[PDB]
């Protein structure tokens, strides 16, 4: 009988860029028509959430960030047909409205109702469900998972298997699905190919998992932090290189290593220089390079279009190119059937109240995914 | 007989940039091992040839330019197995060695023996077959068709149908195959799609022909020269737009016209600014943009990688992604079988001696393809 009532709960509020989260009481309004209020069970720390703190991924402040999570439906608004109270759910930071030209396109997944391209920090109706100290607080990507309760639009939630371990399957809400889809759906990595993966965090390890699933012969991990190399080999990297070890630019090293350039390269960091380097290192006539990393807000890169004229393909994607509401329940079902592993991504577990310690672990280079439990 | 002897003949020599072609007597050495000497019958004037004069496409000078042509084999060197004296042939400015990693790849066509990436202006053996006034003259892309005779490496020539009309099929050497393949093979334009083609010269009109062949529902031609619109409509444009007619940038106009972005865009000009515009006008989640135009030497473009992260694909190609020696004889057979038209591309047919008047017709906006006849 919290149904129809304001919930007072703890959330991690970001009042200001480059400051710690403030764990404090917020007020969470009840769900309006076509909205769902979720009791959160577990949420992951994704670099994109850190980018919001850094100000390199811009979204209105103050905000409740968090987008990689799983919980249990507390109540549904009028007209909700796709989940019920007590259902296990994953919030979808990329919505699936099912009505727009993108949702109807066979390849498209970046639904026109997304809050990423031109962030408002609201529900679909342009208003907020969150109050803190009597002030309105922004949403993030229609999810806001750094809260004991959130409200999402129906197009931004998926029902998942009732027996799902939510402290693992929360990674299906971003990092795993993003990296794995980037390889198997966006790049379409082929059997016997040579891949280069720039960035060996939670998302680039998921890229390596997808390249290995697709049958790549060589998977070259690239990171300036050699501490990331052991786990990258465990999930399928055949060799790892640190650009800081070489006199030559790493695109030239990777071209030499691959006897004239790789089949598939992935930028999984979020830097302009590594996006150009990852394009350059794929073979000039038939190579494919996929941008996964989120670049710093409003900055342009510089490149020589002769890299494309020879035959390269350059593309990017959000959430691994997955249509989110169709894909997430299937990804959970596939996990439950042992088709891929999530434990190799989980390096740390903390209570929600230690969110700032979780961010210090990511920033220090010590963690892959920290999972916070409510 | 000329076989085994030096030929003295007329060629158009470019002694330095931004000067008219010099029509004069050159000496053409006989073919060495795995080389073919061709009597030229017809050659087209491609914008790429004008870019060598402008210095925006760098190749060593002095040079015999020309790459879009057809002629008749005069003689063959030792070891030549794929052509014989008297054969009709098209020189291949993109070779097909059949041995490199690119030639063996199912998609690849930019053979590693090409002279486009790092132009030397020689035969494969690093030497020239041309002298003029006692000076060695460079080759251009392994072809050098602005001459009554040329010598090419065997991997840079294809045998075509003995009954083919050389004054038309010379365009299969460059402009027609490039534009048509860019649409049907590289973009893989789909039935009912909306296409935007930037540049309505010979190559852009050939892109329109491919988009129409692939069953596009809308083909928007873009040119700053409105005199190009009537012919673009004859070959399949459904509408034409001149960016100079609008207060708004044309990417915004084309996004509004296509109710959120086109399925397929093509840059067929060679400008950095229209390469970025063409990418931007394709739908942000599923759009594809192909660079066909040759960009200006050593210059970088500036772009926001968020254009790719949302889901766009950006790619470029040489020669329409056709494997040159396999494809050219099949394109000629397809032409003979009336599967496509070339006459719409041909606005002017001049004797070879009028090469400069041919270039001035292109530069002035008055021609599509001028065919020079020997
Ligand atoms: N496209 C999407 O939908 C999607 C979703 C998830 C994450 N992202 C982005 O993907 C990127 C990675 O996220 P993550 O895996 O959580 O981050 P992470 O755990 O910080 O991993 C990034 C890795 O990059 C390494 N790195 C940093 N700088 C360089 C360098 N110059 N050269 C080589 N390696 C370097 C770094 O050491 C680290 O291991 C971030 O930009 C996220 O914002 C995008
Ligand atoms: N990729 C290949 O294999 C390949 C082969 C053939 C030609 N090309 C290149 O393709 C391009 C076109 O060749 P072409 O068709 O012979 O040239 P063309 O006949 O000069 O056509 C170019 C067209 O672009 C129009 N144009 C020029 N500037 C603009 C502008 N700012 N906005 C809109 N329209 C503009 C112009 O009026 C002209 O109709 C050139 O850069 C060639 O070098 C490349
Ligand atoms: Zn994320
Ligand atoms: Zn949608
Ligand atoms: Zn050309
Ligand atoms: Zn080859």
From Swiss-Prot, chains A, B:
Record's keyword annotation contains Acetylation: yes
Record: residues binding Zn(2+) 2: 97, 100, 103, 111
EC number from the UniProt entry: 1.1.1.1
Catalytic activity: a primary alcohol + NAD(+) = an aldehyde + NADH + H(+); a secondary alcohol + NAD(+) = a ketone + NADH + H(+)
Organism: Equus caballus (Horse)
Main subcellular localisation: cytoplasm
Gene3D superfamilies: Medium-chain alcohol dehydrogenases, catalytic domain, NAD(P)-binding Rossmann-like Domain
Localization annotation: Cytoplasm
Origin: domain of life: Eukaryota
Binding site for an alcohol: 48, 67
Amino acids binding NAD(+): 48, 199-204, 223, 228, 292-294, 319, 369
Protein name: Alcohol dehydrogenase E chain
Cofactor: Zn(2+)
Lineage: Eukaryota, Metazoa, Chordata, Craniata, Vertebrata
């Amino acid at each position: 009988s919290t149904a129809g009532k304001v919930i007072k709960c703890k959330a991690a509020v970001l009042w200001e860029e480059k400051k710690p989260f403030s764990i404090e009481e917020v007020e969470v309004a009840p769900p309006k028509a076509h909205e769902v209020r979720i009791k959160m069970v577990a949420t992951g720390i994704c670099r994109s959430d850190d980018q919001v703190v850094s100000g390199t991924l811009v979204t209105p402040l103050p905000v409740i960030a968090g987008h990689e999570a799983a919980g249990i439906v507390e109540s549904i608004g009028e007209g909700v047909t796709t989940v019920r109270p007590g259902d296990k759910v994953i919030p979808l930071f990329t919505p699936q409205c099912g009505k727009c030209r993108v949702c109807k396109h066979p390849e498209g997944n970046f639904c026109l109702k997304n809050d990423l391209s031109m962030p408002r920090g609201t529900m679909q109706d342009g208003t907020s469900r969150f109050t803190c100290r009597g002030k309105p607080i922004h949403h993030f990507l229609g999810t806001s998972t750094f809260s004991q309760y959130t409200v999402v639009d129906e197009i931004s939630v998926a029902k998942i298997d009732a027996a799902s371990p939510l402290e693992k399957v929360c990674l299906i809400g971003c990092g795993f699905s993003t990296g794995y889809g980037s390889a198997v759906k966006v790049a379409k990595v082929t059997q016997g190919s040579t891949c280069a993966v720039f960035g060996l965090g939670g998302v680039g390890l998921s890229v390596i998992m997808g390249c290995k699933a697709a049958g790549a012969a060589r998977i070259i991990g690239v990171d300036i932090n050699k501490d990331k190399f052991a786990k990258a080999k465990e999930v399928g990297a055949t060799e790892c290189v640190n650009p800081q070890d070489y006199k030559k630019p790493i695109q030239e090293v990777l071209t030499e290593m691959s006897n004239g350039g790789v089949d598939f390269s992935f930028e999984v960091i979020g830097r302009l220089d590594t996006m150009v380097t990852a394009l350059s290192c794929c073979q000039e006539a038939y190579g494919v390079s996929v941008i996964v990393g989120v670049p710093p807000d409003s900055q342009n890169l510089s490149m020589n279009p002769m890299l494309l004229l020879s035959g390269r393909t350059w593309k990017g994607a959000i959430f691994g190119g997955f249509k989110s509401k169709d894909s997430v329940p299937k990804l959970v079902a596939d996990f439950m059937a042992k088709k891929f592993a999530l434990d190799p991504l989980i390096t740390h577990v903390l209570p929600f109240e230690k969110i700032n310690e979780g961010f210090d672990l990511l920033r220090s280079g010590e963690s892959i995914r920290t999972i916070l439990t409510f």
